[PDB]
Amino acid sequence: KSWMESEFRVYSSANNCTFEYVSQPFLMDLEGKQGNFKNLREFVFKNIDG
Amino acid sequence: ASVYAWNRKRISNCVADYSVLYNSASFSTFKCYGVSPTKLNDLCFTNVYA
Amino acid sequence: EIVLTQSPGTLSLSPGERATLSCRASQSVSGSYLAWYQQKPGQAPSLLIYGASSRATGIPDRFSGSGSGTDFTLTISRLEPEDFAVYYCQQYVNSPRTFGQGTKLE
Numbered sequence: 001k002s003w004m005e006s007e008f009r010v011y012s013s014a015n016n017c018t019f020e021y022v023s024q025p026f027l028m029d030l031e032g033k034q035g036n037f038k039n040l041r042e043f044v045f046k047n048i049d050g
Numbered sequence: 051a052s053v054y055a056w057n058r059k060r061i062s063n064c065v066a067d068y069s070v071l072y073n074s075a076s077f078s079t080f081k082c083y084g085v086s087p088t089k090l091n092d093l094c095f096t097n098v099y100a
Numbered sequence: 101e102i103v104l105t106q107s108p109g110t111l112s113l114s115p116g117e118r119a120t121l122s123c124r125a126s127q128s129v130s131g132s133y134l135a136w137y138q139q140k141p142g143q144a145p146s147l148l149i150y151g152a153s154s155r156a157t158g159i160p161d162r163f164s165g166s167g168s169g170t171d172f173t174l175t176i177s178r179l180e181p182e183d184f185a186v187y188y189c190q191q192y193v194n195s196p197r198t199f200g201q202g203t204k205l206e
């Protein structure tokens with residue numbers, strides 16, 4: 001019993017690159033519980049004046 | 051690194067001790083171009099490439 | 101006061117080979133404010149170089165500086181008999197334009 005990320009199919013390669021940021025490592029559950037929803041994550045993204 | 055394989059590091063998201071390149075003055079050259087060794091050095095930088 | 105010490109005091113010994121005349125200073129020469137001089141016996145010194153490596157008018161490029169920091173080089177690529185002369189250094193950094201003690205004196 002262990003839920004771990006195995007696949008990451010997003011991008012192929014990059015030649016130029018300008019901004020990189022990696023947070024400190026942590027641990028996450030990744031297990032799929034059964035029942036009703038229990039978490040709500042709200043985000044707002046804006047882009048003004050650069 | 052060797053000159054042909056010039057190694058680049060990106061200095062990102064940290065304040066910088068710009069009071070760190072002549073006080074030792076081990077370096078023969080702290081010859082700065084455009085920015086100069088001044089308060090402008092010890093100021094906001096979008097990206098720092100070493 | 102920035103003292104200058106020329107290191108080869110009599111390395112020449114009527115030299116028939118390329119030379120490595122040197123000068124060293126207590127505080128590093130800032131911005132290559134150094135010069136070399138050609139003092140032929142019985143005559144006045146003649147400028148040989150300015151900056152670090154910048155050559156002089158009427159002086160062949162066989163005379164070559166190669167200095168930085170503690171500016172220290174005057175290199176005779178192909179040695180000629182007439183060019184023999186005590187060579188002097190002089191620094192325009194802070195010092196009252198002081199000179200070295202001479203490297204090619206008999």
Ligand SMILES: *[C@@H]1O[C@H](CO)[C@@H](O)[C@H](O)[C@H]1NC(C)=O
Pocket residue numbers: 001002003004
């Ligand atoms: C135990 O689970 C991990 C996943 O975290 C997996 O990589 C490993 O192969 C498992 N052990 C065995 C013996 O299969």
Ligand SMILES: *[C@@H]1O[C@H](CO)[C@@H](O)[C@H](O)[C@H]1NC(C)=O
Pocket residue numbers: 015016
């Ligand atoms: C990367 O930046 C350079 C610099 O202008 C540009 O010429 C090039 O097209 C950019 N992209 C790639 C994939 O090299």
